[PDB]
Every structure is written in C-alpha cells, then in structure tokens.
Design a protein around this ligand. Structure first.
Ligand code: 3PE
Lengths: 57, 68
C-alpha cells in the first residue's frame, strides 16, 4: 500500500528545503556543467574522416 | 574530398594501418594501362555525359530501287 504523509521519514522542513531550493535541479545543472570541461567528439570533415571498414558499400 | 587519391582515401578513413607509400610491392595492383586520377567534375563542363552503348535493336532497310 502507498504510504501516507504522516508515515514519512523526512521532516517537513527538510522536504521544504529541497522543494524551495531546487536540489535535484541543481544536481542536473552540475552534471550538465561537468560536460562543458570534457573533450568534444567532433571531427573536422573534410580534413578528417570517420571510420571506414573493408566491408563498406 | 573527391581530390584525395584512392588508397589515401582509405588510409585517411582508418581503413588500413600502413600508408600507400609504405605498402610492399606484392600488395599493389598490376596495371597494363596508364593510371589517371580525375576528381568529381560535377557542375563543370567536364561532368559525365551518359549514353547508350548499343546501336538500335532493329536496323531499317537501306532503300534501293530496281528497274522493271
Ligand atoms: C524551507 C523554508 C523556505 C522558506 C521560503 C523560501 C524563500 C524562497 C525560496 C527561493 C526559491 C523559490 C522559487 C522556487 C520554488 C520552487 C517551487 C517548485 O518546486 O515549483 C513546483 C511547481 C509545481 O508545483 P507543485 O504542485 O507544488 O509540485 C509538486 C508536483 N507534484 O513546478 C515548478 O514550477 C518547478 C520549479 C520551477 C523551477 C524553474 C527553473 C528555471 C530556472 C532554474 C533556476 C535555477 C538557477 C539557475 C542559475 C544557474 C546556477 C548557478
């Protein structure tokens, strides 16, 4: 059975902190920002070329 | 990209480890004709003109008169 509000482990104040300060949204923003400092994947066609195999058609 | 010679085109694509100049003589095609490289000529007067390589299926009669 789904639990009711009164049987919740977290206090209302902590839940309200997460609610008003957008905790998971800031976690998402941080994960996005981490990509900004990684090596990109692009290659510079037509000066470079993607992989080609003997079987290519 | 059409100006890359064949063989180098494959190397640049990571097709092979060894560049064309470094390949042994055994693994080079033998040619009985002169080798000529020509890139893509589209948008130029050198573009390919296709045509039918066969003469027509049915050959008409060459008219000749005879005297009665
Ligand atoms: C604990 C005591 C606190 C006392 C009061 C606190 C004072 C004010 C607190 C400051 C922040 C208040 C403004 C944001 C409050 C967020 C409330 C919220 O979550 O909105 C929920 C809303 C749907 O409403 P609801 O039905 O209640 O959600 C339950 C759904 N089952 O659905 C939504 O609208 C989603 C939330 C909207 C978020 C907008 C995001 C757009 C921009 C992102 C901002 C992030 C910062 C960006 C800056 C870059 C980072 C450096």
């Amino acid at each position: 059975r789904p639990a009711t509000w009164e049987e919740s482990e977290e206090g209302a104040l902590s839940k309200a902190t997460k609610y008003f300060l957008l905790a998971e949204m800031f976690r998402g923003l941080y994960v996005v920002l981490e990509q900004f400092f990684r090596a990109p994947y692009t290659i510079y066609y037509p000066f470079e070329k993607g992989p080609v195999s003997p079987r290519f058609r | 990209m059409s100006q890359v010679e064949p063989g180098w085109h494959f190397w640049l694509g990571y097709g092979v480890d060894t560049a064309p100049c470094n390949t042994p003589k055994e693994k080079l095609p033998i040619r009985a004709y002169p080798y000529k490289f020509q890139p893509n000529y589209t948008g130029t007067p050198g573009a390919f003109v296709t045509y039918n390589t066969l003469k027509p299926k049915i050959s008409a009669w060459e008219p000749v008169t005879k005297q009665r």
